[PDB]
Design a protein around this nucleic acid. Sequence first.
DNA 1: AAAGAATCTT
DNA 2: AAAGAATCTT
Lengths: 233, 236
Amino acid sequence: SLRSDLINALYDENQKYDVCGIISAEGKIYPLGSDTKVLSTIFELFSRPIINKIAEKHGYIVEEPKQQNHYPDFTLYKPSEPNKKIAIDIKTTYTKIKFTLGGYTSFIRNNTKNIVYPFDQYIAHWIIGYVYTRVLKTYNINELNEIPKPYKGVKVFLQDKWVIAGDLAGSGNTTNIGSIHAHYKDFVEGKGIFDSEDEFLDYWRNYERTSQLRNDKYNNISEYRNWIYRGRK
Amino acid sequence: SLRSDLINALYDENQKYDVCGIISAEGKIYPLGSDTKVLSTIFELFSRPIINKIAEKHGYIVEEPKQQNHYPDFTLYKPSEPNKKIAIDIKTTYTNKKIKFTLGGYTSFIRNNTKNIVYPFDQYIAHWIIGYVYTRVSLKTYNINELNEIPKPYKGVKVFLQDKWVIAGDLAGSGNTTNIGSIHAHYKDFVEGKGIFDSEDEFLDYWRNYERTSQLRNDKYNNISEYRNWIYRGRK
DNA sequence: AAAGAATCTT
DNA sequence: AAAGAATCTT
Ligand SMILES: [Ca+2]
Ligand SMILES: [Ca+2]
């Protein structure tokens, strides 16, 4: 299974290799920072070749966005199964945890908005989630093991987005779907709040931007289900 | 001075080294992406040791933010004169073959002395911007012996150190994220400091009173000329 | 252009 | 929670 092999490959790479700096062609090494801004960029680069290997192993073509502001990080597809593409997106958080699962105002409400391929052709939306416990000169190659690593214990999971999605927004002005606020294992096990991928889509598709507005609609799943029960009114 | 030395230091470092990938303690190397989110991070990390080096050469303590949404990237100051701190922020943008930068938020520390800033805004006497401009240029991993084989994610890169106010423009750099926009000019004007403001006082006031949407400022000011007219009218 | 896409803090 | 802080595309 692509998914089976991918998570095993990622889980394995994570376990066997520790990123500790950026290197120049001339061999000079610059240490890393402890900002998620830095580490998220790192975790994506660390993931790229592994995703590529497993995909090719399964006959999948991997495409990355051409222009920025486009989802997802990696689009996987067989030329024979063009309308059954799978979306893989890298997400990071640090230390219960929570992730911002992308916007609810672009591709989920508009088939072609801010997405490499029309939302139509994807049959799966996976999230490779990384969590790290947060913890000034250069080094030569001969010092790789001496460079202080900017994190304590990174963990990685592979889950379906709809399965780890929560009912509360992940961000305000940038309108992101928020994930469940739970322990790492709950992500691996897929202990979400939605009963189906459809309920997930419907919910974030009609979620109002501010609590002012969703005060008169729904602010959580229970209220959403009541809103559903009465006739979406 | 610290400023000249730093600028000299940055130029020389950028000339001598080409960042090409991330390296593991085990020696495996993962290539770099060619997207500015990746490159911004890289360039920031590349600058840190040089900045720290020179600062130390001048007697300055370098402090980075303890929290994430906090300006600036680096705060330099002598412990003898803590009220005279220097803010240094790393900015990045790209060219395909005139450029522009997003110079920071206009609703945070500039309007509130302690909002989203490491130290109260009033303790900084200078706000420097180290700007990187790369001309936009693998899927495998490498070993330490293959460094010359790893693809460089940029065709070229230039760096400048300039006063934030000097390069600021009158049009916003971002909408929802309310960022100050820089001048839309050729790299040389950034180095030359050919801005639009008469002084830093005018720069600060313009951004402290800039309305976030067209409608709002439509009845105030959209550009420098209109701002100057707004001043004439009595800040009305 | 101006507006709005692309994880964290109080 | 909430809401708003932290380069790109049209
Ligand atoms: Ca990406
Ligand atoms: Ca991502």
